[PDB]
Short mmCIF file of all heavy atoms in Angstrom, two decimals:
data_model
loop_
_atom_site.label_atom_id
_atom_site.label_comp_id
_atom_site.label_asym_id
_atom_site.label_seq_id
_atom_site.Cartn_x
_atom_site.Cartn_y
_atom_site.Cartn_z
N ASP A 1 25.02 -12.32 14.93
CA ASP A 1 24.44 -13.68 14.89
C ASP A 1 23.28 -13.70 13.87
O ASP A 1 22.14 -13.91 14.24
CB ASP A 1 24.00 -14.12 16.27
CG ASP A 1 22.99 -13.18 16.91
OD1 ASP A 1 23.06 -11.97 16.58
OD2 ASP A 1 22.12 -13.71 17.68
N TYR A 2 23.67 -13.55 12.61
CA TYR A 2 22.68 -13.56 11.55
C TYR A 2 22.00 -14.95 11.39
O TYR A 2 20.98 -15.03 10.73
CB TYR A 2 23.31 -13.13 10.25
CG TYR A 2 23.65 -11.62 10.18
CD1 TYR A 2 24.93 -11.23 10.32
CD2 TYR A 2 22.65 -10.73 10.00
CE1 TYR A 2 25.24 -9.85 10.25
CE2 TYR A 2 22.95 -9.37 9.95
CZ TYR A 2 24.23 -8.96 10.08
OH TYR A 2 24.53 -7.60 10.04
N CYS A 3 22.63 -16.00 11.93
CA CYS A 3 22.01 -17.31 11.83
C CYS A 3 20.69 -17.37 12.58
O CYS A 3 19.80 -18.16 12.21
CB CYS A 3 22.97 -18.38 12.39
SG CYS A 3 24.71 -17.93 12.24
N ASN A 4 20.49 -16.54 13.61
CA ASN A 4 19.32 -16.54 14.43
C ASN A 4 18.31 -15.48 14.03
O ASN A 4 17.34 -15.28 14.78
CB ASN A 4 19.70 -16.37 15.90
CG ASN A 4 20.60 -17.47 16.40
OD1 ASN A 4 20.51 -18.62 15.98
ND2 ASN A 4 21.57 -17.11 17.22
N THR A 5 18.50 -14.77 12.92
CA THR A 5 17.56 -13.78 12.46
C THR A 5 16.54 -14.33 11.53
O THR A 5 16.73 -15.35 10.87
CB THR A 5 18.31 -12.59 11.78
OG1 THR A 5 19.28 -13.14 10.90
CG2 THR A 5 18.96 -11.70 12.78
N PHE A 6 15.39 -13.65 11.49
CA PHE A 6 14.33 -13.99 10.54
C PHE A 6 13.34 -12.85 10.50
O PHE A 6 13.41 -11.94 11.31
CB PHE A 6 13.62 -15.29 10.93
CG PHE A 6 12.76 -15.20 12.13
CD1 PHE A 6 11.42 -15.70 12.09
CD2 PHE A 6 13.21 -14.69 13.33
CE1 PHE A 6 10.62 -15.58 13.20
CE2 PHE A 6 12.40 -14.63 14.44
CZ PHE A 6 11.10 -15.06 14.39
N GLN A 7 12.46 -12.88 9.49
CA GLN A 7 11.46 -11.83 9.34
C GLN A 7 10.22 -12.45 8.70
O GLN A 7 10.28 -12.80 7.48
CB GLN A 7 11.99 -10.66 8.51
CG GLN A 7 11.09 -9.44 8.58
CD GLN A 7 11.60 -8.31 7.72
OE1 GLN A 7 12.50 -8.47 6.90
NE2 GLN A 7 11.05 -7.12 7.91
N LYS A 8 9.16 -12.60 9.43
CA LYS A 8 7.87 -13.08 8.92
C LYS A 8 7.02 -11.86 8.63
O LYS A 8 6.62 -11.12 9.55
CB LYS A 8 7.18 -14.03 9.84
CG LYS A 8 8.04 -15.22 10.28
CD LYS A 8 7.28 -16.21 11.11
CE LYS A 8 7.99 -17.56 11.18
NZ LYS A 8 7.16 -18.60 11.82
N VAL A 9 6.69 -11.60 7.36
CA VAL A 9 5.89 -10.47 6.93
C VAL A 9 4.64 -10.98 6.27
O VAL A 9 4.73 -11.59 5.17
CB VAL A 9 6.67 -9.56 5.97
CG1 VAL A 9 6.00 -8.19 5.89
CG2 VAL A 9 8.10 -9.40 6.41
N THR A 10 3.48 -10.79 6.90
CA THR A 10 2.21 -11.07 6.26
C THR A 10 1.90 -9.90 5.36
O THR A 10 1.59 -8.79 5.81
CB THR A 10 1.14 -11.39 7.32
OG1 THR A 10 0.08 -12.18 6.70
CG2 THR A 10 0.55 -10.17 7.97
N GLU A 11 2.06 -10.12 4.05
CA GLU A 11 1.81 -9.02 3.12
C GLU A 11 0.34 -8.77 3.04
O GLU A 11 -0.50 -9.69 3.01
CB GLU A 11 2.35 -9.38 1.75
CG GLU A 11 3.82 -9.78 1.73
CD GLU A 11 4.76 -8.65 2.03
OE1 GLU A 11 4.27 -7.50 2.12
OE2 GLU A 11 5.99 -8.89 2.24
N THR A 12 -0.05 -7.47 3.00
CA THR A 12 -1.47 -7.13 2.97
C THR A 12 -2.02 -7.65 1.62
O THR A 12 -1.30 -7.71 0.63
CB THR A 12 -1.65 -5.64 3.06
OG1 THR A 12 -0.75 -4.97 2.18
CG2 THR A 12 -1.40 -5.16 4.50
N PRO A 13 -3.28 -8.04 1.59
CA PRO A 13 -3.88 -8.51 0.35
C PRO A 13 -3.75 -7.48 -0.81
O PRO A 13 -4.19 -6.35 -0.63
CB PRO A 13 -5.35 -8.82 0.69
CG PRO A 13 -5.34 -9.03 2.14
CD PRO A 13 -4.29 -8.11 2.69
N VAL A 14 -3.22 -7.93 -1.92
CA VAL A 14 -3.00 -7.05 -3.07
C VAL A 14 -3.95 -7.49 -4.17
O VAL A 14 -3.96 -8.69 -4.54
CB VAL A 14 -1.54 -7.08 -3.56
CG1 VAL A 14 -1.30 -6.04 -4.63
CG2 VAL A 14 -0.61 -6.92 -2.40
N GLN A 15 -4.75 -6.57 -4.69
CA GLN A 15 -5.70 -6.86 -5.74
C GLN A 15 -5.09 -6.51 -7.07
O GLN A 15 -4.85 -5.33 -7.37
CB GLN A 15 -7.00 -6.10 -5.53
CG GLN A 15 -8.05 -6.84 -4.76
CD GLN A 15 -9.28 -6.05 -4.48
OE1 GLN A 15 -9.36 -4.85 -4.81
NE2 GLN A 15 -10.30 -6.70 -3.89
N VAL A 16 -4.78 -7.52 -7.88
CA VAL A 16 -4.17 -7.34 -9.17
C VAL A 16 -5.22 -7.57 -10.24
O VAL A 16 -5.89 -8.58 -10.24
CB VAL A 16 -2.98 -8.33 -9.37
CG1 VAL A 16 -2.25 -8.00 -10.63
CG2 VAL A 16 -2.05 -8.32 -8.16
N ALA A 17 -5.36 -6.56 -11.15
CA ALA A 17 -6.33 -6.63 -12.25
C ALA A 17 -5.58 -7.01 -13.53
O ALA A 17 -4.59 -6.37 -13.87
CB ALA A 17 -7.04 -5.29 -12.40
N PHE A 18 -6.06 -8.07 -14.15
CA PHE A 18 -5.47 -8.60 -15.40
C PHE A 18 -6.47 -8.30 -16.53
O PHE A 18 -7.24 -9.18 -16.94
CB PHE A 18 -5.15 -10.08 -15.28
CG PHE A 18 -4.15 -10.42 -14.21
CD1 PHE A 18 -4.37 -11.42 -13.31
CD2 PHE A 18 -2.95 -9.73 -14.13
CE1 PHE A 18 -3.45 -11.72 -12.32
CE2 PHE A 18 -2.05 -10.04 -13.15
CZ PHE A 18 -2.28 -11.04 -12.25
N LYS A 19 -6.39 -7.10 -17.05
CA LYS A 19 -7.27 -6.66 -18.13
C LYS A 19 -6.59 -6.72 -19.51
O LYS A 19 -6.96 -5.96 -20.42
CB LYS A 19 -7.78 -5.25 -17.85
N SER A 20 -5.61 -7.60 -19.66
CA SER A 20 -4.90 -7.73 -20.92
C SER A 20 -4.28 -9.10 -21.06
O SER A 20 -3.85 -9.73 -20.07
CB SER A 20 -3.80 -6.63 -21.07
OG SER A 20 -4.36 -5.33 -20.92
N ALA A 21 -4.21 -9.55 -22.33
CA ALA A 21 -3.54 -10.82 -22.59
C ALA A 21 -2.09 -10.78 -22.13
O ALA A 21 -1.55 -11.81 -21.65
CB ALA A 21 -3.62 -11.16 -24.07
N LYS A 22 -1.46 -9.62 -22.26
CA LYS A 22 -0.06 -9.47 -21.75
C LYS A 22 -0.04 -9.58 -20.23
O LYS A 22 0.93 -10.10 -19.68
CB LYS A 22 0.54 -8.19 -22.21
CG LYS A 22 -0.10 -6.94 -21.62
CD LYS A 22 0.11 -5.69 -22.46
CE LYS A 22 1.60 -5.44 -22.75
NZ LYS A 22 1.81 -4.16 -23.49
N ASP A 23 -1.06 -9.10 -19.58
CA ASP A 23 -1.14 -9.20 -18.10
C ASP A 23 -1.19 -10.68 -17.67
O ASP A 23 -0.49 -11.16 -16.81
CB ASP A 23 -2.32 -8.40 -17.58
CG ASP A 23 -2.16 -6.93 -17.84
OD1 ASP A 23 -1.13 -6.50 -18.41
OD2 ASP A 23 -3.06 -6.17 -17.45
N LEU A 24 -2.12 -11.46 -18.31
CA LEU A 24 -2.17 -12.86 -18.06
C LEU A 24 -0.84 -13.53 -18.42
O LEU A 24 -0.42 -14.49 -17.75
CB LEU A 24 -3.33 -13.49 -18.81
CG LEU A 24 -4.78 -13.31 -18.36
CD1 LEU A 24 -4.97 -13.46 -16.87
CD2 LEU A 24 -5.31 -11.94 -18.78
N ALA A 25 -0.21 -13.06 -19.52
CA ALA A 25 1.06 -13.67 -19.92
C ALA A 25 2.13 -13.50 -18.87
O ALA A 25 2.89 -14.42 -18.58
CB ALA A 25 1.47 -13.09 -21.26
N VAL A 26 2.27 -12.26 -18.34
CA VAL A 26 3.28 -12.04 -17.32
C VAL A 26 2.99 -12.89 -16.10
O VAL A 26 3.87 -13.49 -15.48
CB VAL A 26 3.43 -10.55 -17.00
CG1 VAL A 26 3.93 -9.78 -18.22
CG2 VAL A 26 2.16 -9.93 -16.49
N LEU A 27 1.68 -12.99 -15.68
CA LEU A 27 1.37 -13.79 -14.56
C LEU A 27 1.75 -15.24 -14.77
O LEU A 27 2.37 -15.87 -13.92
CB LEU A 27 -0.17 -13.75 -14.23
CG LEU A 27 -0.59 -14.47 -12.94
CD1 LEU A 27 -0.11 -13.74 -11.70
CD2 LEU A 27 -2.10 -14.67 -12.96
N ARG A 28 1.46 -15.82 -15.96
CA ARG A 28 1.84 -17.20 -16.21
C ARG A 28 3.36 -17.34 -16.37
O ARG A 28 3.87 -18.45 -16.14
CB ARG A 28 1.12 -17.76 -17.44
CG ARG A 28 -0.39 -17.76 -17.33
CD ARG A 28 -1.05 -18.25 -18.57
NE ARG A 28 -0.84 -17.34 -19.66
CZ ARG A 28 -1.82 -16.70 -20.33
NH1 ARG A 28 -3.10 -16.85 -20.04
NH2 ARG A 28 -1.48 -15.88 -21.32
N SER A 29 4.05 -16.28 -16.76
CA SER A 29 5.50 -16.34 -16.82
C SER A 29 6.13 -16.38 -15.45
O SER A 29 7.23 -16.91 -15.30
CB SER A 29 6.06 -15.16 -17.62
OG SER A 29 5.84 -13.95 -16.89
N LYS A 30 5.45 -15.81 -14.42
CA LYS A 30 5.97 -15.94 -13.06
C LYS A 30 6.02 -17.43 -12.67
O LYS A 30 4.97 -18.13 -12.68
CB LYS A 30 5.09 -15.21 -12.06
CG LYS A 30 4.86 -13.75 -12.37
CD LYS A 30 6.16 -12.96 -12.65
CE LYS A 30 5.88 -11.51 -13.05
NZ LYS A 30 7.07 -10.70 -12.89
N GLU A 31 7.25 -17.92 -12.35
CA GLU A 31 7.36 -19.29 -11.97
C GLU A 31 6.77 -19.57 -10.62
O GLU A 31 6.28 -20.67 -10.34
CB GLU A 31 8.87 -19.71 -11.98
CG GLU A 31 9.77 -18.93 -11.06
CD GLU A 31 10.38 -17.68 -11.68
OE1 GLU A 31 9.77 -17.20 -12.70
OE2 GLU A 31 11.44 -17.23 -11.24
N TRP A 32 6.80 -18.60 -9.72
CA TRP A 32 6.28 -18.77 -8.34
C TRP A 32 4.75 -18.85 -8.28
O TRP A 32 4.21 -19.27 -7.28
CB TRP A 32 6.75 -17.67 -7.42
CG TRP A 32 6.60 -16.25 -7.97
CD1 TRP A 32 7.54 -15.46 -8.56
CD2 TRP A 32 5.39 -15.46 -7.94
NE1 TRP A 32 7.04 -14.26 -8.87
CE2 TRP A 32 5.73 -14.20 -8.54
CE3 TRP A 32 4.07 -15.68 -7.49
CZ2 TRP A 32 4.80 -13.21 -8.68
CZ3 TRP A 32 3.16 -14.66 -7.64
CH2 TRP A 32 3.53 -13.44 -8.22
N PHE A 33 4.08 -18.50 -9.34
CA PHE A 33 2.61 -18.53 -9.37
C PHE A 33 2.13 -19.80 -10.01
O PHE A 33 2.59 -20.18 -11.13
CB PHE A 33 2.07 -17.30 -10.16
CG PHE A 33 0.57 -17.33 -10.36
CD1 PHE A 33 -0.28 -17.01 -9.32
CD2 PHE A 33 0.04 -17.77 -11.57
CE1 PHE A 33 -1.63 -17.05 -9.51
CE2 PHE A 33 -1.34 -17.78 -11.75
CZ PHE A 33 -2.17 -17.41 -10.72
N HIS A 34 1.27 -20.56 -9.31
CA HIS A 34 0.69 -21.79 -9.84
C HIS A 34 -0.82 -21.66 -9.80
O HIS A 34 -1.41 -21.16 -8.85
CB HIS A 34 1.17 -22.98 -8.94
CG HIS A 34 2.63 -23.01 -8.67
ND1 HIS A 34 3.23 -22.19 -7.73
CD2 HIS A 34 3.62 -23.72 -9.26
CE1 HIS A 34 4.52 -22.44 -7.70
NE2 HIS A 34 4.79 -23.36 -8.62
N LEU A 35 -1.46 -22.17 -10.86
CA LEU A 35 -2.92 -22.19 -10.96
C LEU A 35 -3.42 -23.62 -10.72
O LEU A 35 -3.13 -24.53 -11.49
CB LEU A 35 -3.33 -21.69 -12.35
CG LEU A 35 -3.84 -20.29 -12.60
CD1 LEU A 35 -4.58 -20.21 -13.90
CD2 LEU A 35 -4.78 -19.75 -11.48
N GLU A 36 -4.24 -23.79 -9.68
CA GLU A 36 -4.76 -25.08 -9.32
C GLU A 36 -6.23 -25.22 -9.81
O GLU A 36 -6.71 -26.35 -9.86
CB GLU A 36 -4.75 -25.27 -7.81
N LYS A 37 -6.90 -24.13 -10.14
CA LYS A 37 -8.26 -24.16 -10.64
C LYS A 37 -8.25 -23.38 -11.97
O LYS A 37 -8.01 -22.19 -11.98
CB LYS A 37 -9.26 -23.54 -9.66
CG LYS A 37 -10.72 -23.85 -9.95
CD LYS A 37 -11.23 -25.02 -9.12
CE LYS A 37 -12.72 -25.01 -8.98
NZ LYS A 37 -13.44 -25.47 -10.20
N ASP A 38 -8.50 -24.10 -13.07
CA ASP A 38 -8.52 -23.46 -14.39
C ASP A 38 -9.87 -22.73 -14.56
O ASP A 38 -10.88 -23.33 -14.87
CB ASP A 38 -8.37 -24.53 -15.49
CG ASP A 38 -8.16 -23.90 -16.87
OD1 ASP A 38 -7.96 -22.69 -16.94
OD2 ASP A 38 -8.24 -24.66 -17.85
N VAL A 39 -9.81 -21.38 -14.41
CA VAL A 39 -10.98 -20.57 -14.54
C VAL A 39 -10.54 -19.23 -15.19
O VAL A 39 -9.39 -18.93 -15.30
CB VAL A 39 -11.64 -20.27 -13.17
CG1 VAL A 39 -12.38 -21.49 -12.64
CG2 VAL A 39 -10.60 -19.78 -12.14
N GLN A 40 -11.57 -18.49 -15.64
CA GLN A 40 -11.34 -17.15 -16.27
C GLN A 40 -11.55 -16.12 -15.16
O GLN A 40 -12.55 -16.09 -14.48
CB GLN A 40 -12.33 -16.93 -17.39
N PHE A 41 -10.50 -15.27 -15.00
CA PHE A 41 -10.48 -14.23 -14.01
C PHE A 41 -10.10 -12.90 -14.59
O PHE A 41 -9.22 -12.87 -15.53
CB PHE A 41 -9.60 -14.58 -12.80
CG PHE A 41 -8.25 -15.09 -13.20
CD1 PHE A 41 -7.23 -14.24 -13.53
CD2 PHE A 41 -7.98 -16.43 -13.22
CE1 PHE A 41 -5.97 -14.67 -13.89
CE2 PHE A 41 -6.75 -16.91 -13.56
CZ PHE A 41 -5.72 -16.05 -13.93
N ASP A 42 -10.63 -11.83 -14.08
CA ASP A 42 -10.21 -10.49 -14.47
C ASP A 42 -9.53 -9.75 -13.30
O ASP A 42 -8.78 -8.84 -13.53
CB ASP A 42 -11.41 -9.64 -14.96
CG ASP A 42 -12.31 -9.23 -13.81
OD1 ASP A 42 -13.22 -10.03 -13.45
OD2 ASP A 42 -12.15 -8.09 -13.29
N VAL A 43 -9.80 -10.15 -12.05
CA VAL A 43 -9.16 -9.62 -10.87
C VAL A 43 -8.86 -10.75 -9.92
O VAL A 43 -9.68 -11.66 -9.73
CB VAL A 43 -10.00 -8.54 -10.19
CG1 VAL A 43 -9.50 -8.21 -8.80
CG2 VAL A 43 -10.03 -7.24 -10.98
#
């Protein structure tokens, strides 16, 4: 009865460091990531 299955996983907080223009580029290429506050961040 796979219709009644589910899995809620609270992923532990992951600290991602973006120390490169390519790092920011891959983040912005992720479609699932949205930026609501336009700010400069390194982590």
Side-chain angles (χ1 to χ4, degrees), residues 1-18 20-35 37-39 41-43:
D1 57 328
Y2 289 104
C3 330
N4 300 323
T5 44
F6 72 130
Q7 193 181 12
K8 304 187 165 189
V9 197
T10 202
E11 306 292 352
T12 48
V14 189
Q15 268 177 353
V16 188
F18 298 132
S20 304
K22 68 202 305 183
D23 296 0
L24 287 314
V26 297
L27 186 71
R28 299 179 293 242
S29 69
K30 305 311 176 161
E31 60 271 22
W32 48 260
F33 174 78
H34 312 79
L35 259 196
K37 196 96 157 78
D38 187 13
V39 287
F41 46 83
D42 74 276
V43 165

